[PDB]
């Protein structure tokens, strides 16, 4: 009938072993009219009796409280831990053999939903994937890592891009909308992630992590049913002699049981004190309501009785497991009935069953790379930086012209990337200023000298264009790849675990796009190397060449903080240009510094540079060839301050369109910016 | 092949300081990283600072930053550390690598002495 607080209270808090806090418990049932709990699970084969059994009787529980209760089927989840043979089509028939075990487990199918991961997540493509993003971003790569035991796996090591997994099942709290999560132990590290994220974002709420019991394995050396054996475990529907034989060879030590040490990461230590005969009796037969179990008469009405009676040796080993047998094979006879009179639900076990000799010990299937787009298309990320400086600039504008020329067939693609930036902390991590200094620096670009012909794309357009296979081509991609092959991209400095996935969104963005090079400035070819790596050899790397506009500093004499003024941005002004060439070291009867660089630099571009001359000094004179520049800076016979001037003359003009949408189309990201960069004290 | 080799090193007084150099052959060094590592007595190697084409990105260890500058003549196909402040924690084997990107490097110098002790 009608429950009050502190009975609903009472009821919720016995699911859990653990709950983070008893406290938010109390002041979600009191305040919430409809509390949502969730639990996950990974289709990966036969369902085991902790997933069925057990889970029903905590639902039931949770539903009783007044709950809803959502099962969120992980195919996608699976699928990045490897699971099936990597088959995502027989991953989503595992799914469906599950939600039928459910559906027959006796639970309130009015308060229980069950949800599809990749089919939720897919309908909201936008809110989801941000958010994983933004987990990436303001973690540590080491802070996921310790995350590896949600999966069964063991950190550094073995993982393979299992960085991203954790990181959605982290999102998957606030995105279901969950008010409780109500998984086992061993995922309560990432659980704990979670409450460390509503931190970081200032949510005041975080969610009650109501944490259950690990449920033991069978066999002696394993405190965990596993995949190992499956002697370990028993499934939903193992036949009632199946069920038999495995009880009968179980361990089954004479000890009383104690509450184990919850250990940081959660997962179970092995221990020959625990006895999985005495957990099976003391989580799927003494939980429910009104439970009671029976030896040769007597009747034992708590779990504590039962016990008692088997360390003073009043019931014997096999008496015990002939109880648990008779307890287990009665509870899984609805499931056993529900396969044998239902066509559908007989096949979906039978396919189930198939892939024991049908998916595992053959090598794990995993995405194919496409073959080669047939027309030549590069591909060129944009920097998200506010200050570009003009050497890197100029490389990339040169890069895109030399490409053109070599393959006048093809095509050159400018990526804008709004969203890996951000992932990333590119600037301030807020996608309002990296998406205004991208489309700032774009615009400069073009001032400065790039091509009409080449065509300027958002990752925005590509990823929400591509909702699903996009982000599939990123788990396909993930799965091939070690972390520490990642990490060494960056010299073991990765700042954040969103540069893991920004390494990943780039390769399957330069697939999206039928990509047959990749141009890399000086500072991203660590990044795009992956994208040549990835696919064998198929993508080419071309790097744009800098080197040929220097600091304006003495070499020799570099101060040990660079200052603004001493190398030049796409983004200066007339003042800054003005400012920076005046500061600018030169000296006479020197052949070489960095005025004479630049000034050889637009020789090159321009044909030639006019000094202007009032006589007395020389009067005018041209200079056609390097050579016969830094001749006369080398005698003498051109002055410093000079050709200073008319370095500066050049520069002012080059410049010319550029500053024009500085004071103008681009005045109101400008502002932005510059606030931006301020806000960048530390 | 490529070649390198770094010059500067000798004994100064804590608070001293010096100036390495690398002169380079055999790569393009001007459109190149450039690399400053160094290997203390008993330890590993571990990069100081490093540089890109343009003398335009920067990077310095945090033990060094405020007190060593890195700088280049493309010009020249040099590079240079100069190192003020010295302290006896910075005594080590000085070399000089060419970097295949700002996160790594390969070929390096013999090397240039440097102590720093009273």
């Known amino acids: 009938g009608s429950m009050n607080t502190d009975e609903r209270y009472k009821l919720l808090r016995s699911v859990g072993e653990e709950c983070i806090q008893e406290s938010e418990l109390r002041n979600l049932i009191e305040k919430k009219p409809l509390i949502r709990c969730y639990d996950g699970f990974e289709p990966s084969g036969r369902m085991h009796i902790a997933q069925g059994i057990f889970k029903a009787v905590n639902v039931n529980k949770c539903t009783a409280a007044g709950c809803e209760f959502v099962f969120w089927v992980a195919d996608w989840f699976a699928l990045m831990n490897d699971k099936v043979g990597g088959e995502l089509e027989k991953i989503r028939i595992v799914g469906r053999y599950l939600i039928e075990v459910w559906k027959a487990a006796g639970m309130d199918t009015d308060k229980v939903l069950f949800l599809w991961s990749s089919e939720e997540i897919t309908s909201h493509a936008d809110t989801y994937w941000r958010m994983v993003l933004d987990i990436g971003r303001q973690n540590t790569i080491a802070r996921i890592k310790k995350c590896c035991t949600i999966m069964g796996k063991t950190e550094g090591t073995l993982t393979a891009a299992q960085v991203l997994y954790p990181l959605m099942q982290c999102c998957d709290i606030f995105f279901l909308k969950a008010d409780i999560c109500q998984l086992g132990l061993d995922q309560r590290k990432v659980n704990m992630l979670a409450r460390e994220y509503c931190d970081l974002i200032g949510r005041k709420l975080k969610p009650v992590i109501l944490s259950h019991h690990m449920l033991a394995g069978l066999r002696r050396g394993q405190a965990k049913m596993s995949k190992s054996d499956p002697d370990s475990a028993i499934f939903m529907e193992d036949t009632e002699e199946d069920v038999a034989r495995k009880i009968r060879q179980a361990y089954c030590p004479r000890v009383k049981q104690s509450a184990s040490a919850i250990t940081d990461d959660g997962a179970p230590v092995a221990t020959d004190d625990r006895n999985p005969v005495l957990d099976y009796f003391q989580c799927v037969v003494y939980a429910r309501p009104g439970a009671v179990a029976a030896i040769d008469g007597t009747t034992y009405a708590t779990y504590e009785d039962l016990e008692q009676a088997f360390v003073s040796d009043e019931v014997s080993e096999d008496a015990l497991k002939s109880c648990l047998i008779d307890e287990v094979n009665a509870l899984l006879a609805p499931v056993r009935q529900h396969f044998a009179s239902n066509e559908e639900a007989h096949e979906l076990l039978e396919a189930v069953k198939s892939y024991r000799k049908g998916g595992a010990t053959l090598p794990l299937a995993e995405t194919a790379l496409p073959a080669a787009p047939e027309k030549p298309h590069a591909c060129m990320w944009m920097p998200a930086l506010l200050k570009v400086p003009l050497d890197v600039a100029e490389g990339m504008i040169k890069a895109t012209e030399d490409f053109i020329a070599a393959h006048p067939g093809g095509t050159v693609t400018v990526v804008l990337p709004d969203w890996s930036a951000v992932a990333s902390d590119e600037i301030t991590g807020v996608e309002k200023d990296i998406s205004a200094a991208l489309q700032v620096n774009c615009a400069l670009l073009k001032a400065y000298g790039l091509p009409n012909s080449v065509k300027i794309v958002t990752e925005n357009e590509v990823i929400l264009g591509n909702r699903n296979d996009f982000w599939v081509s990123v788990i396909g991609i993930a799965r091939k790849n070690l972390l520490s092959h990642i990490e060494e991209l960056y010299g073991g400095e990765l700042r954040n675990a969103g540069q893991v996935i920004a390494a990943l969104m780039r390769v399957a963005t330069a697939l999206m796009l039928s990509v047959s090079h990749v141009i890399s400035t000086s500072l991203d070819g660590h990044i795009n190397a992956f994208a040549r790596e990835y696919t064998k050899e198929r993508i080419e790397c071309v790097q744009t060449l800098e080197g040929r506009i220097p600091a304006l500093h003495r070499p020799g004499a570099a101060p040990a903080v660079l200052g603004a003024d001493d190398v030049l941005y796409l983004d200066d002004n007339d003042m800054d240009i003005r400012r920076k060439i005046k500061k600018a070291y030169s000296a006479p009867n020197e052949e070489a510094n960095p005025v004479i660089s630049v000034a050889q630099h637009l020789l090159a571009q321009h044909g030639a540079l006019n000094i202007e001359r009032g006589e007395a000094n020389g009067g005018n004179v041209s200079y056609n060839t390097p050579e016969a520049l830094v001749a006369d800076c080398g005698s003498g016979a051109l002055h410093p301050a000079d050709l200073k001037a008319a370095v500066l003359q050049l520069l002012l003009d080059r410049s010319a369109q550029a500053r024009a949408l500085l004071n103008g189309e681009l005045k109101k990201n400008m502002t932005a910016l510059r606030n931006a960069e301020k806000k960048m004290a530390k | 092949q490529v070649q390198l080799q770094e010059s500067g090193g000798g004994l100064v007084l804590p608070g001293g300081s010096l100036r390495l150099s690398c002169a380079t052959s055999?790569?393009?060094?001007?459109?190149?990283?450039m690399y400053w590592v160094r290997q203390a007595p008993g330890k590993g190697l571990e990069w100081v600072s490093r540089i890109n084409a343009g003398g335009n990105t920067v990077d310095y260890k945090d033990s060094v930053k405020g007190r060593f500058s890195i700088s280049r003549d493309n010009a020249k196909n040099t590079l240079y550390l100069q190192m003020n402040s010295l302290k006896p924690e910075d005594t080590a084997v000085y070399y000089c690598?060419?970097?295949?990107?700002?996160?790594?490097?390969?070929?390096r110098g013999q090397g240039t002495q440097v102590t720093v002790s009273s």
């Open positions: 690598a060419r970097g295949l990107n700002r996160y790594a490097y390969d070929s």
């Open positions: 055999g790569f393009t060094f001007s459109n190149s990283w």
